[PDB]
Amino acid sequence: HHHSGMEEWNFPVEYDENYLPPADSRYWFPRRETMPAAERDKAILGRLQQVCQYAWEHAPFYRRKWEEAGFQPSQLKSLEDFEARVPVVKKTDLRESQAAHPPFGDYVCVPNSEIFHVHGTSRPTAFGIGRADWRAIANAHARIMWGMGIRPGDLVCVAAVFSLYMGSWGALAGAERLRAKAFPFGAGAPGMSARLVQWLDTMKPAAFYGTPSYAIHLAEVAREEKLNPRNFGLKCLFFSGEPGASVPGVKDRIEEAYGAKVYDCGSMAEMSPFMNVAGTEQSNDGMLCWQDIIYTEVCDPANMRRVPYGQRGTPVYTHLERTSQPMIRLLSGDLTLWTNDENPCGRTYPRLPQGIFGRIDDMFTIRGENIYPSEIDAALNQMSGYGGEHRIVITRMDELLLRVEPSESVHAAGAAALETFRTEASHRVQTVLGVRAKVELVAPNSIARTDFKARRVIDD
Template identity: 30%
Template sequence: MPSDTVTLAQRQSLRYLLDSVRGSNAFYRRKLDGIDFEPDAGDLALLPFTTRAELQKDQEAHPPYGTNLTEPVEDYRRFHQTSGTHGRPMRWLDTPDSWQALTDCWCTIFTAAGVGASDRILFPFSFGPFLGFWVAFDGASRLGAMVIPAGGTSTLGRLQMIAENAVTVVCCTPTYALHMAEVAAGHGIDLAASTVKSLIVAGEPGGNIPEVRAKIEKAWGARLFDHHGMTEVGPVSFECHEKPGGLHINEEHYLAEVIDPSTLQAVPDGTPGELVLTTLLRKASPLIRYRTGDQVILTRGKCACGRYYARLEGGILGRVDDMFTVRGNNVFPSAVEAILRRFDEVAEFRLTVFDRGPLAAVQLEVEPVSATIDARSLCEKVSRTIHDELHFKAGVTPVEVGSLPRFEMKAKRFVRK
């Protein structure tokens, strides 16, 4: 659809959404009380933001699910909850209609990556309460693909499942894709010669960090596709086959804005800011102008793939609250990871920031791939590169091989003290 048609469809969906929540959703009935807003052409700034903090407060005041429910609780069939990385976990419910909308999003993610009914898709993680596992699995089933759950087994066991079942697509975090490659190399398994043609990654910014992407694609001999979403919002974005290096917002389902997190005012397209989302078709448990905390650069126009959907250049650049400042330099952890991934001698790392106002101190632990590596020389090279490119000094120290944790889900390499 051309962009004006997309906008028209969004505004129509927004009207339906607002009519629904004003009628039966206690949370948004309170928030929207007294606000005069015309959905077809009104300024979105007239609608209030929704924040994670107020959703958490609402669930604490009205346990267990809060009041952001448009239908009677008996009509909900799906329960999920957030990871709690940024506070107390939030519980989230979906009706069959809302769940259908979410699986529609995953069908778009898969088809944009060239995945279809002939594929065999491996899900190498233990299914927990997070939404992403389940909705991706159901979306793949709707496409007619073979879906292979690989929870409850080791990384080596999952690699064997890939070989034995001629798996063509793997869904995981960028961190776990790298860890699987590390384990494969340690057991003499040539991943690049496997049947896997594509990896769809999410959960971290790594999929659109060029150095991370290059390392994964080289190890697997396969194309990487990035994606991002959240339990409370759903599967938001996808990477098209024709133009890597960015994420399309699925604008049939999401209305996207970008604001300055300090002034809360909209920023021009192409300017960094915080992503704000309205879930247009998940009416049973909606979010209106939800501040995601994700730092993005949004652009518009026709993509090489033919879509007019808004595009996040470079994907998710980082979390607004993860940015740290060292002697006037604003730095995201993803910028440090981009440097680390250039060094083939680095197996894993951990970044600790000691907040002391403008004099924040940065400590970086680096684990080499082998005990034969000159760890001291490696750390000196890493420190020098960080200073040259990010303009601050980090204390870089080596740690023993195998001593840093490995992650199946979201990596926790960034520590703030």
């Protein structure tokens, strides 16, 4: 047994399948979840050394990538060495590896005979998950679902498509390991939602899994079917796959529609167990980073080194308990804010208070400061007077200009209504960015509208 007191802490992991926490325990693993972060970081470092050494020996993808970047496992002697020496893995590197070594790439590690399930992404990426990794996922997900207040015997509805995507399978595996009554109804086919609302009104689930948008659609289908969604008897709904569970307006509407608590969870399919970022019953706002399952680093995309707590960056993830297709510093490309304050549940994990929002796409620097176009887009979309289009113009790091469309009604209301909107837009942009921007208005329907992804940045 490990000197850290950490429960079933070993690599490769082999969890006791019959263990269930005492019924009065808040934590599935009290020590792993509440030990001082400094001691957990020491244990994490030792695990990263084991995992990197493991990939060096079983994955030519990593040995090659690391050798090109001048890294070798003997060099990993601190978490500072991990961020500075180990290069990040991109999705394009995974697709390249799978194209050169089909079907699963040369980072699979396990022999082909160990592959239990085949899943994938929406050129697609193939997931070849080993038996041992499937057990490691089910155990981590049961542990995190316990944290949400979900218990043995509870009826758990998994209402997400059961296909290629890791989402629904991960929730179902967690529900099975927890000894919950699993109700794998799924989603995606016409006529399903109207059938589900009758099943939920009869069966009375204690918990529901899906996407926030599907839960909003199911609430509407219920009212069309002359059913009250508050009568399904749900204690909670837990969501992954898209934003919404940490967006105040969206979360509040779902909590009101169902009369239950909403929990945010979910990193990436590549990062299963994806509930490694998840809220708890008491830390119900945003998500906790369950660091001893998967090591999350919120980084500055300019150098891929950890940003200080209270700052914004990109989640970078490392598997600590996977032997098949392990991910070592996979860049998410998402945006988030992390803190390390006391958590209401008592868990000593970093928190993502606003969950995951935006992207690193088309990021630029205005004198040391990283500016994210998604953040400027989010700030303007808080305004009822915003017309739906804007452009980002940079001159001389140095000068930041924003060309913004007001809506048709603001433009019709006159000169004073346009100026009030332009001044408020300047105030809101400064708040979100934390840097001064010049704001100029442009006539409604002046800027090009694209059905594709908008590329709103001009020059540098």
